[model samples]
Every structure is written in structure tokens, then in C-alpha cells.
Target: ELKIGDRVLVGGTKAGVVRFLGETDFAKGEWCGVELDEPLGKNDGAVAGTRYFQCQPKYGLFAPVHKVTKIGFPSTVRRVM
Candidate 1:
């Protein structure tokens, strides 16, 4: 399980900070709110026109648990940021 203040990588590429973990309006199951480091995010942690949390443009997003992993995962390829 992941918690707030932990750094995670979304989609195995974008480094992000975990801000929230709970249910969302757009998707089923648990959604994790991540503040991405780069400008590759889809929404500012919002979905279906509702904002779960505030974030910069292309910076925040909500994703399923399967798409997220703790930073420095895979051992073979670790990213620090």
C-alpha cells in the first residue's frame, strides 16, 4: 500500500508525489492522486470536471493502483527526482 508523502512513478515514466488515496468519481476502485513532476499529466487530479485536489496544468492526475509504483522500482531502471 502507498501513502501520502511518498514519491511514485506514474505509467512507469512520470515521477510524481502522492497527495491522496481514495475513491474518485470518474473511475471505479481506488484512485491515487499524484502531482507529477513533468508536464505529461492528463488532468490536475480531476476527473469528469471535478477536482479532487488542485495542481498545475498537466501536473496532477488520478490513476489506478496498478499504474502506480513506488519510485526507484524495477531495480534495473531507477529514477531519482
Candidate 2:
């Protein structure tokens, strides 16, 4: 399970920090509020109608729990270019 302070990768495309994890005013399933490594997002950790966490604008992202990939396990994805 993801928890606050757990560093993760968003689709193995962007590095980020899991700031919040739970339901929100948006989806019906669990969501993970992430503070991306860079300002390449849309929200600052806030969801549809509530701010789950705090971060820079365009640096926040809320994704379903399944889409989030754990940073380290054994065969984590890594860029090779």
C-alpha cells in the first residue's frame, strides 16, 4: 500500500512523492495525490473539490491506486535513453 513520504513513479514517466492516499470528491475508488518531481502537471495535489495535499500548481496529480507503480521492488521500470 502507498503511504505519505513514499517516493514513486507516475507511469514510469515522472518521479513524484505520494503526499496523500484516499478517496476524494472525484473518483469512487482510492486515489493517490502526488507531488510530481517537476511542474509538469495540472493541480497542486488538490482534487475535484478538495485539496488533499499542498504543492506547486501544475505539479500535482491525482491518480487511481492501480496506476501508481511502487518505486522499488525488484523490477522497477527505468528509462534507457
Candidate 3:
């Protein structure tokens, strides 16, 4: 399950930062609402709605649960330099 402040990649493209975790609709379990840090493509433009992006785990992806094989996965948390 992803927690708040967790960074994840969606659809192997859109990069997002987890904002909220709750059950809205569709799939159950750990559903995280992430804020896109960057746009994956032109189709994925910044909008004001809940746009679910489909993605896989990137390098350094961390998660509390095992086998998080879903549309999105943890990528890397934002680091301060």
C-alpha cells in the first residue's frame, strides 16, 4: 500500500507524487491519488480532475506491500539537495 508523499510512475510514462489514499471507485485495496510532477505526453496534460495514469515500477521503487503489480508503482521520493 502506498502512503502519502510517495512518488510513483504511472503508465510507464507520467510521473506522479502520491497525495491521497482512499477508496473512490473502481479498484479497491490501496488506491493512491497522486499529483503529476511531470507530464508523460501531450495527451496527459495538467488538468483539475482525477486522471488515473497507468504505469509500472521504476528504478528505486519502494513499497510496503509485496507484489505491487498494478497500473502504478513507487518510483523515487523527492530528495532535497
Candidate 4:
């Protein structure tokens, strides 16, 4: 599952840190907000006049849960336990 502070890749190229993850009035279900490494983003962790998180302008972006993918995790690796 996705969580705050996790490194993620947006749209398969854009990279950034996870800032927010939850429900919002602008849409249904869950949404993930990321602080992009570059300025290729939409908003500064806000949308629909509602602030979801905090970041630089054009550095923050909110996307659907399915569109975002968690990085730095190896799915093939088995647990040592």
C-alpha cells in the first residue's frame, strides 16, 4: 500500500516524494499527492480551491491511486522472516 514519505514515480517518468494520500471533495475514492523533483506538475498540493498538502508551485501533483506507482520496493524479493 502507498503511504506518506514514500518515493514514487508519476506518469512513469516524473519522480518525487509522497506528500498526501486520502479522500478529497474534488473527487471520489483516494488520491495521491506528490512533490515532483522538477517543476513539471499541476499544483502546489492543492486543487479545487482546497489544499491537500504543501509544496512549491508546479512541484505538487494529485493523481488517482492507480496512476501512481510506489518505487524502491522489490516485489520479487521474499521476506527473510
Q: Provide the TM-score for each candidate, comma-separated.
A: 0.83, 0.82, 0.41, 0.84
Please provide, for model 3 over 1-79, each residue's C-alpha lDDT reduced to its tens digit, 9 standing for 90 to 100.
5566665555444455665555543455655555555433232312234444433322122222332223443333342
- What is the per-residue lDDT of model 4 for residues 4-80, given as tens digits with 9 covering 90 to 100? 99888776667889999999988899999999999999899888889999899999989886767777543222221
Clash count, one per candidate: 0, 0, 5, 0
Which residues of candidate 4, in runs, are more than 4 Å off?
72-81
Q: How much is the lDDT of residue 19 in candidate 2?
A: 89
Clashing pairs in 1: none
- Per-residue lDDT value at 12 in model 4: 64
TM-score of 3: 0.41
Worst 10 residues of 1 by lDDT: 72-81
Compared with the true structure, model 1 gives a TM-score of 0.83
lDDT of each: 0.81, 0.79, 0.42, 0.83
Regions of model 2 farther than 4 Å from truth? 73-81
Indicate which candidate wins on lDDT: 4
Ranking by lDDT: 4, 1, 2, 3
Among residues 3 or more apart in sequence or in different chains, the pairs in candidate 3 whose N, CA or C atoms overlap within 3 Å are 10-54, 10-55, 11-54, 11-55, 12-55
Better of 1 and 4 by TM-score: 4
lDDT of 1 by residue, 1-81 (tens): 789878898877788899889887777889899998888888776778777888888898788888789986751244442
* Local accuracy of candidate 2 as per-residue lDDT tens digits, 1-81: 788889877766777899888878877978888899888788987766687999999999888876677776421345411
